[PDB]
């Protein structure tokens, strides 16, 4: 351990800091509901019955 126990703010002060990697604008209003409809219903690829969620990483 470095310095004392019961020291406030430790982990937010240790953590290495990284800048935002985004650039492009997102859609708003009607145009975002249009995009969500086309992605969820219109053209779709089938799977085995253990069906897969929208954010599957591995």
């Amino acid at each position: 351990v470095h310095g004392s126990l019961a020291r406030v703010g430790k982990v937010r002060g240790q953590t290495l800091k990284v800048a935002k990697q985004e650039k492009k604008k997102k859609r708003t209003g009607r145009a975002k509901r249009r995009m969500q409809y086309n992605r969820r219903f219109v053209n779709v690829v089938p799977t085995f019955g253990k069906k897969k969620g929208p954010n599957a990483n591995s």
Binding site: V8, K10, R12
Partner: protein, 142 residues
């Protein structure tokens, strides 16, 4: 089991219900007013007070931590309170002998989670919000 049913029984029915309502724990404290005299806020949602002392309280097992808290004296009654300070490192903003706004912890006078005997939390310091200090939107004026 035996409830009376006769067509002239309305005085027995009305007055027995009135007598039996006083056995409900929520009804009684709302209508006697002893809880309204005892509550360190006089029926308000929030209160202002002045910071006496900064303290660390040991959490209840099966877990292990030191929970950062403050002891506070309220402006309108002069009575004493202890209150929790949310988020990582926020105790560094608070200083001593200055005004905080305090609020309830979310369970209508009962304690919350592993912290023993703490019923309140800090929400504003020297007229700036802890959220605006923590997200870097504002700073303490000096």
């Amino acid at each position: 089991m035996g409830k009376c049913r006769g067509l002239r029984t309305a005085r027995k029915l009305r007055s027995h219900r009135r007598d039996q309502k006083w056995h409900d724990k929520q009804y009684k404290k709302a209508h006697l007013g002893t809880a309204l005299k005892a509550n360190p806020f006089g029926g308000a949602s929030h209160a202002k007070g002045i910071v006496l002392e900064k303290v660390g309280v040991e959490a209840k097992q099966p877990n292990s931590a030191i929970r950062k808290c403050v002891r506070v004296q309220l402006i309108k009654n002069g009575k004493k309170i202890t209150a929790f300070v949310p988020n990582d490192g926020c105790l560094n903003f608070i200083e001593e002998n200055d005004e905080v706004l305090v609020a309830g912890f979310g369970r209508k006078g009962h304690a919350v989670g592993d912290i023993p005997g703490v019923r309140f939390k800090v929400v504003k310091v020297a007229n700036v919000s802890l959220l605006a200090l923590y997200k870097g939107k504002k700073e303490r004026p000096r």
